[PDB]
């Protein structure tokens, strides 16, 4: 009864991080060392938890949330960073437990002319809370004159699109990114890793 | 007070893009959220 990871990490399309993709993972065992040791991955930090011993840990519950992101701003996906994405888009608490796994996908999410199917936001009247998703589309009142709902002076669509093209640098190019939540809370704990 | 500064910084970038240097109309936006969180 093995849990459906592929459908995570081998899936077609991603999200954009501003509206990031949640699974659920509930009653299944694990193989992680083959995420360890399928080796594809150019980050896969881990917190609260060591990525060798979990194989040997259970967990009541798993979410796995994934999206887009450029490389410059994987750093920001781990517990306890600001910038555009941990503050607008994708928000970790201090308390995370879990692992951070992102791999490069110039190959897949770039476009010759840009790619555009994935936005970001910039604009948001404070930082999200952890977890929090904000897929709102309100047009952003950034002076004291009203925006009445249309684009304008100080009134900006807060999606920003990437421009994912092929010859970005590296730090440019769109990193798709999964971060597994591992639920150690007051049950029996369902999702268990290759041993017991 | 940046009202203006704000509102031409932003045209930077949707100009940027437009013409192209998508890296750099990134590396705006960047800026842009550096200089809103910048009291
Ligand atoms: C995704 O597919 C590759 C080979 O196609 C495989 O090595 C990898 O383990 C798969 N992912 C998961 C989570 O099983």
């Not at chain 2, 045209?11 to 109309?25: F, K, N, P, V, Y």
Request: glycine residues 8%.
């Amino acid at each position: 009864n093995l849990c459906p990871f592929g459908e995570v990490f081998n899936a077609t399309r991603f999200a954009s991080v501003y509206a990031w993709n949640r699974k659920r993972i509930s009653n299944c065992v694990a193989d992680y060392s083959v995420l360890y040791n399928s080796a594809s991955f150019s980050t896969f930090k881990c917190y609260g938890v060591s990525p060798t011993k979990l194989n040997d840990l259970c967990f009541t519950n798993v979410y796995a949330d994934s999206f887009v992101i450029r490389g410059d701003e994987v750093r920001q996906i781990a517990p306890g960073q600001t910038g555009k994405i941990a503050d607008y888009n994708y928000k970790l608490p201090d308390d995370f437990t879990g692992c951070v796994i992102a791999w490069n996908s110039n190959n897949l999410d770039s476009k010759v002319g840009g790619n555009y199917n994935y936005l970001y936001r910039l604009f948001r009247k404070s930082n999200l809370k952890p977890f929090e998703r904000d897929i709102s589309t309100e047009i952003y009142q950034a002076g004291s004159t009203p925006c009445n709902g249309v684009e304008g002076f100080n009134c900006y669509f807060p999606l920003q699109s990437y421009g994912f093209q092929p010859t970005y640098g590296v730090g440019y190019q769109p990193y798709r990114v999964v971060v597994l939540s591992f639920e150690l809370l007051h049950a029996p704990a369902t999702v268990c890793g290759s041993n017991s | 007070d940046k009202e203006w500064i704000l509102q031409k910084i932003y045209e930077i970038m949707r100009r940027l893009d437009e013409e192209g240097h998508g890296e750099a109309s990134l590396r705006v936006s960047d800026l842009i959220y550096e200089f809103m969180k910048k009291d």
